[PDB]
Amino acid sequence: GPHSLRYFVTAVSRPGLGEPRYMEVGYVDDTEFVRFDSDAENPRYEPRARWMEQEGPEYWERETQKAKGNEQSFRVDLRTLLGYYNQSKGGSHTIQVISGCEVGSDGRLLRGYQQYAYDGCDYIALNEDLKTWTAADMAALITKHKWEQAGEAERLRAYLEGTCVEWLRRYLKNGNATLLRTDSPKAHVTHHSRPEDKVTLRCWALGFYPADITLTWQLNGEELIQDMELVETRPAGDGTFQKWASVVVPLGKEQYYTCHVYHQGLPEPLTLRWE
């Protein structure tokens, strides 16, 4: 199927306590693979997946220098934005960026993205055309103007279409055993009493990769909507994921309800009941 290279970038000011904290975290699909953190003992880009250990010193030096350069740019940004918004020098503020590209199963670009936020709100983003910006407020319009005069969209477009795609392909190649693998979910159902002759049935799915999964409860070939609780799919500490979905059903009628688990690694979806 399709595949993604994504960078999550965060810069956070801390007036009175030194320079901002700056972090870059990289993912191929749902797997963390590189990280830079300014508060580490020796700040440098580091592998977060064993397959990246194959990249030689020149990769690490080039990425580390890009990261220290980005740290300095975001440091400047934080200061600039205080001015755009007429803010005091004494408060903590956050810039976030998501940056990357998605290619299809044929290796070609499906979409590229570059979205910025300030203090948790949309600021500026590159449009799907890869040519023009969309600005969320009057401050971001200053950035938009700066970036148009500089030809920033054309430089960003060259990265999204060339560099980003080409490095995604390389990463998929170098880590294919890990990245192209499929780990199947293992499922079970648990039972919990409630007041007034009601019970919670909770359906668990464990040990799966990729993260994308769907869990549903049925009654008579009918997917339940009401009384449903769930958690967002979540990492389990070893590069696999887990999830659960529960429903409140009347005491003694547990045997009517079925949990259904759908995943890329299953030849057929799983159906299961309380036991």
């Binding site: 960078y7 970038v9 870059e24 990289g26 080039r62 990425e63 890009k66 990261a67 350069g69 980005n70 740019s73 975001f74 400047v76 940004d77 600039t80 934005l81 810039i95 960026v97 940056s99 570059q114 910025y116 500026i124 950035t143 700066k146 970036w147 500089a150 920033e152 430089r155 960003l156 990265y159 560099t163 980003c164 490095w167």
Partner: peptide, 8 residues
């Protein structure tokens, strides 16, 4: 590989 970001 990460982008080299512009100032805002």
């Amino acid at each position: 590989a990460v982008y080299n970001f512009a100032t805002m």
